[PDB]
């Protein structure tokens, strides 16, 4: 929200923890959901 | 920097707008915004007045052509260029001013009407589309025709979503330029499903087939946004306030009295109001003095001032709306307070700058593209002839051969004599020329010169004093 | 973009106008809208004033023809073109402004009133139909007669759910062109069965048969929309407010005083109001000092201000209505408050721009088409003879043979002297010709020259001093 | 000094802003600041007016080129310098103002449109970017194509934390100069994540390949700061205040009256307000006088003044905002109170100083860099030929060959006559030249002189009087 | 009913009588004169006899 990103895919950010031993992390996060409008268009068989 | 922070006392802790280009902020809600703006243009007086101002001041009552080819680059010569310009101007003037309205396929407009509609449809929708086709079966001199397409029609086929290479019914290549457009079918009845076609922008020879005119704001913008997005909310709320205040005024002024008694409804009105039992209607003749027993009473109800400070609030809102649209406040609201000459002239010039900008971009670009599309035919069908010994063929440089300047209607000054006096003062000195002055009245100096050379002869032959401009 | 969203605080969450074409948003309510507009015109003071202003300013007291065939395109030669113009103008003058009124089949209107009524119908209906007929049984020189058809009688296909091609009773081909119209019969008694007839737009020979005039808004518009859809609701509500306020004022002023007493009504009104028992009327002569016993009482009712700020609200509403319609506020409301010269001139200019636009479109197009329809008949009947060696026949160049211009009534100057000085100053320089300055006053220069060249002869022959314009 | 102390009575005890450079005060909240600026511009009546005023007064409708190479520094000769200037001006006038709009790859803007977009972006973002590229596929004479890059695109790669040399997606060498810009691709719906690419500022040959324009505030400012940070809070709060006031006015005017009774909810309305049970709708026709028992009552509500001082406080806030942005209050608010000539002219001067500053810096720098980037192709592609005996080649002194000054649109005077009289009297004396006087009206004096020298011949040939400027 | 009511208004009320008097006084005035101008070109007769006629 602070940098104006919401409802998008692959939001990357990179931060450093403030402390006497300081470490740097890297994180990417998304909300992936996949759909079909018509669930009955594809026929899936198993052959043998 | 306090702008990018929390704010004064944390009041802006929730003001966190998304950071996204014009596309991500416009495309999902295009149709709704267009429909609301069309509602406001159709069902609000002020917005329709603003649209009429746009149409009348941008274009006017005539949109004249002035052909000025760049003859120096082409290496053709001045006299041949003048003859070519005269011929092509005459051909255009006869073609586009047909009384039977055969420039457009629908046979409902003329050239000036079409330019005005283009400006208006730019105003309340953000873009204008013109399609150039042929009617092969027609036997006229020119087979070129133009059809005006409303922006609502351009949509993705089958109402699917936006893919990377097809945004809002407009094909986009690897770069931002367009390649072709998807056009629906005119469906007036709800039923009879719609058929979606495909129209390439340019024919393979380079001739224009589909025209799209709109001013971008950012880098990549498939379709523009109309002028109303700044003041969509305020005009609707202003309309609601006006209607509500009017209804409230009528209700408050309706109840002119109140009867207090303890008798029947009929007898109380008989004895106090004066109605007759043969609720009960009362005739308004005369002045009446009732007689009341101790139990009864009569109150003449009083209402507030009908217009308590509503006019000034309407003034503030109309000033805001006018500032949003671009038309001056006195042109929008018809207010015209007591003002000196200087204030009126300042306001007129401030609106005029914007009007001239819009005319120079929108109408001029559309008319230039249409004129080029017509000039290809004239040249190809040999209605007119190209100057000989030309460095470039017509196709290699369309702009150089078809370069054109358009003249609209001139402004109507606040003071009649001062404009004429300044025009004469400029012409007497070298600061200007006859062409620029005659253009500010929407006239062509060559036509004026021809008219004057005819008038001097007509006066001389008939026995009258020769005119002022006549040479001894 | 907040315009297309939910709104500020959810205030606009219920304003979702449908995204439909102009036709699907106009045609289902066409008849009711036309009827409401007619009701407003026939029963409101301001609507009638607006129509009267339209007719009197756009057209005026006279609508004179000016014929200018394009001789350069036809290659006919200047003198032949001028002679042909003179003959055509004389024929039209003899046929248009006749006293027997045979231009119209109904034998009720001359040409100027026909133009005025066309502008009126285009004002409160947004269209006008003129039908050009023949009466071969007639013995007059010109057998071409015109008829004005009310847009109500151009009915739909009998109101049934219509279709794509056949819309609003105007048959349409694949493109937007209109092929044939439907005409009904206007039966005043109201019991005759209705009969619908087909009248094709154009005769097989190319002649114009049934004429439609209107200004479109979007890509496709079968029938136009009047200038009242913007401001009907406010007009009706304002009228209701006026009537309600007037009735409330009358009710409040009717009850003068109020008698409170214990005795019988005849005795109480006998001993106080002064009415004699010899209801009971009271004489209005003199001054009276009633004597009240402790039980009795008299009260002189006081009423609110008769107009407690109603005029200001009327001002606001009339300003809105004027903004919607198009005319200035002063002309519509007859207010004409205190204002300087600059404000009045700005008002007049802002009105006259729109008036010129309307005149250049609707009246000019209708007059040109009617004139061409008559001109074909005049040419065929050898009443007027074309020049020989013509590059085209009359059929091949319809507009070029009859490219005509019309001059209407000119402005009434606010300052009588300033306009005269402006015209003289422009004539002294070469900026404007004699025709342009004589036409702004609505006079033709040729007639003025002929009048002056006979006036000089009369003054010379009668023994008076020669005029100023004579050549020594 | 009490400025740096506790204050009057310790009221400023908590006001201890941190002493930080502009880089550490802008960058942490960069994107949110730009996003809030865009949101204010996109949804406010006043912000769009400020942007429109910037565009229309800084640049206008035409932005002409005037080439004045430094011939003395190069030592080439006056005649050769003028020949080169004429040739290059003709070539640029052809390339810049094509109606095919092929200067940028998207084919949506002309050159003046691009300058206006640059000015607007410099207004509400603080910086503008232009990418100059080549198209080997294009077969036209000139292969140079430009682009407009939105400032949002250029950011750090993959949002990686900021560094020393690479700040906010702009790379810095050891000194303060910049070498390359990381610019990302932008597809709003999806696809693979944004790919951040490298684009060097300048090619190895010295040509400018990427343009960045912004005016610094301190010694080191990697990216610019927009103009809205001063007043972003106040415009949002004024928006909230206006919407809240309008909703409050609607709410207060909605409830017309009030009914107190003890019967059924519908019976009380049947007997008092007069509705019919044949809530219950009430007809507004006519006047009414109810009948009440002792228990009942009717009350006509009175609402507060709709606009109780809100206009004056809005005036104060608009004065503050106008001071912040730069445009004068009279332009931004459309108020135009009764002001003499002196006040209006002073305010116009105050606006024009800032507008001249912006035009001289922003648009001029962008246009100069664009023109130089184009002039390199020309010189190289032998479309034009350099003068002989040059002391330096083109790459040695690029500014020497492309030294140019641009002409924008002039000012529209409050009184037209007075400025013309001023110009004439200055011309009569030796204080000013014709070039400056004709430049202040946005005219090129050589074109004007050619126009008079052609018009005198045209007047001589047709038989009219010689003009005033002609030489006996 | 409409014509009778209009007659009632014009007979008895001051503003209607003033409006009708304004119509009569400004449309026509105190006199009405004739100027006979036959279109002599259309009839092909002449000018002197046209003026005498």
From Swiss-Prot, chain A:
Protein's cellular compartments: Virion; Host cytoplasm
Self-association and partners: Homomultimer. Interacts with FI protein.
Family: Belongs to the lambda phage major capsid protein family.
Domain of life assignment: Viruses
Protein name: Major capsid protein
Source organism per UniProt: Escherichia phage lambda
Gene: E
Known role: Assembles to form an icosahedral capsid with a T=7 symmetry. The icosahedral capsid is about 60 nm in diameter and composed of 415 major capsid proteins. The assembly is primed by the interaction between capsid assembly protease and portal dodecamer, and major capsid proteins assemble cooperatively to form the procapsid with the help of capsid scaffolding protein. Major capsid protein forms hexons and pentons of the icosahedron. Viral genomic DNA is packaged into the procapsid through the portal vertex.
Swiss-Prot record, chains B, C, D:
GO CC, any one term: viral portal complex
InterPro entries: Phage_lambda_portal
Domain of life: Viruses
Gene Ontology MF terms in the entry: DNA binding; structural molecule activity
Keywords: Capsid protein, DNA-binding, Viral capsid assembly, Viral genome ejection through host cell envelope, Viral genome packaging, Viral long flexible tail ejection system, Viral penetration into host cytoplasm, Viral release from host cell, Virion, Virus entry into host cell
Main subcellular localisation: virion
GO-annotated biological processes: symbiont genome ejection through host cell envelope, long flexible tail mechanism; virion assembly
Cellular localization per UniProt: Virion
PTM field: Proteolytically cleaved by the viral protease during capsid maturation.
Annotated function: Forms the portal vertex of the capsid. This portal plays critical roles in head assembly, genome packaging, neck/tail attachment, and genome ejection. The portal protein multimerizes as a single ring-shaped homododecamer arranged around a central channel. Binds to the terminase subunits to form the packaging machine.
Assembly: Homododecamer. Interacts with the terminase complex composed of two small and one large terminase subunits.
Annotated family: Belongs to the siphoviridae portal protein family.
Name listed for the protein in its UniProt record: Portal protein B
Organism: Escherichia phage lambda
Encoding gene (name): B
Swiss-Prot record, chain E:
Protein name: Portal protein B
Subunit and interaction comment: Homododecamer. Interacts with the terminase complex composed of two small and one large terminase subunits.
Family per similarity comment: Belongs to the siphoviridae portal protein family.
PTM comment text: Proteolytically cleaved by the viral protease during capsid maturation.
Localization: Virion
Function per UniProt: Forms the portal vertex of the capsid. This portal plays critical roles in head assembly, genome packaging, neck/tail attachment, and genome ejection. The portal protein multimerizes as a single ring-shaped homododecamer arranged around a central channel. Binds to the terminase subunits to form the packaging machine.
């Amino acid at each position: 929200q602070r940098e104006g990103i919401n409802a998008s895919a692959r939001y990357p950010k990179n931060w450093v923890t403030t402390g006497d031993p300081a470490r740097e992390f890297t994180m990417i996060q998304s909300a992936p959901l996949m759909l079909l409008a018509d669930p009955d268009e594809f026929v899936s068989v198993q052959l043998a | 920097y306090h702008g990018g922070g929390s704010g004064f006392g944390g009041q802006l802790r929730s003001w966190n707008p998304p950071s996204e280009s014009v596309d991500a902020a416009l495309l999902p809600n295009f149709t709704r915004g267009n429909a609301r703006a069309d509602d406001l243009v159709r069902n609000n007086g002020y917005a329709a007045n603003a649209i009429q101002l746009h149409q009348d001041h941008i274009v006017g009552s005539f949109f004249r052509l002035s052909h000025r080819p760049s003859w120096r680059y082409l290496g053709i010569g001045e006299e041949e260029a003048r003859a070519f310009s005269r011929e092509v101007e005459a051909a255009w003037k006869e073609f586009a001013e047909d009384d039977c309205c055969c420039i457009d396929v629908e046979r409902k407009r003329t050239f000036t009407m079409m330019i005005r509609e283009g400006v208006a449809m730019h105003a309340f929708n953000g873009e204008l589309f013109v399609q150039a086709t042929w009617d092969t079966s027609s036997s006229r001199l020119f087979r070129t025709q133009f059809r005006m397409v409303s922006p609502k029609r351009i949509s993705n086929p089958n109402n699917t979503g936006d893919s990377r290479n097809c945004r809002a019914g407009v094909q986009i290549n690897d770069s931002g330029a367009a390649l072709g457009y998807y056009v629906s079918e005119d469906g007036y009845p709800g039923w009879m499903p719609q058929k979606w076609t495909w129209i390439p922008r340019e024919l393979p020879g380079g001739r224009a087939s589909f025209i799209h005119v709109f001013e971008p704001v950012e880098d990549g913008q498939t379709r523009g946004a109309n002028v109303f997005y700044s003041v969509m909310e305020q005009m609707k709320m202003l309309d609601t306030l006006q209607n509500t205040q009017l209804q409230s005024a009528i209700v408050k002024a309706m109840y002119a009295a109140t009867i207090e008694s303890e008798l029947d409804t009929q007898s109380a009105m008989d004895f106090i109001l004066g109605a007759n039992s043969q609720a009960a209607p009362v005739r308004l003749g005369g002045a009446k003095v009732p007689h009341l027993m101790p139990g009864d009473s009569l109150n003449l109800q009083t209402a507030q001032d009908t217009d308590n400070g509503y006019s000034v609030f309407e003034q503030s809102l109309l000033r805001y709306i006018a500032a949003g649209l671009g038309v001056s406040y006195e042109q929008l609201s018809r207010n015209y307070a007591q003002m000196s000459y200087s204030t009126a002239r300042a306001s007129a010039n401030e609106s005029w700058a914007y009007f001239m900008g819009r005319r120079k971009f929108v109408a001029s670009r559309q008319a230039s593209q249409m004129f080029l599309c017509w000039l290809e035919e004239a040249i190809v069908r040999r209605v007119v002839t190209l100057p000989s010994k030309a460095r470039f063929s017509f196709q290699e440089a369309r702009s150089a051969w078809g370069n054109c300047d358009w003249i609209g209607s001139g402004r109507m000054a606040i003071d009649g004599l001062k404009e004429v006096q300044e025009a004469v003062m400029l012409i007497e000195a070298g600061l200007s020329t006859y062409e620029k002055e005659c253009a500010k009245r929407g006239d062509d100096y060559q036509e004026i010169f021809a008219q004057q050379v005819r008038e001097t002869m007509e006066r001389r032959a008939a026995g009258l004093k020769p005119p002022a401009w006549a040479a001894a």
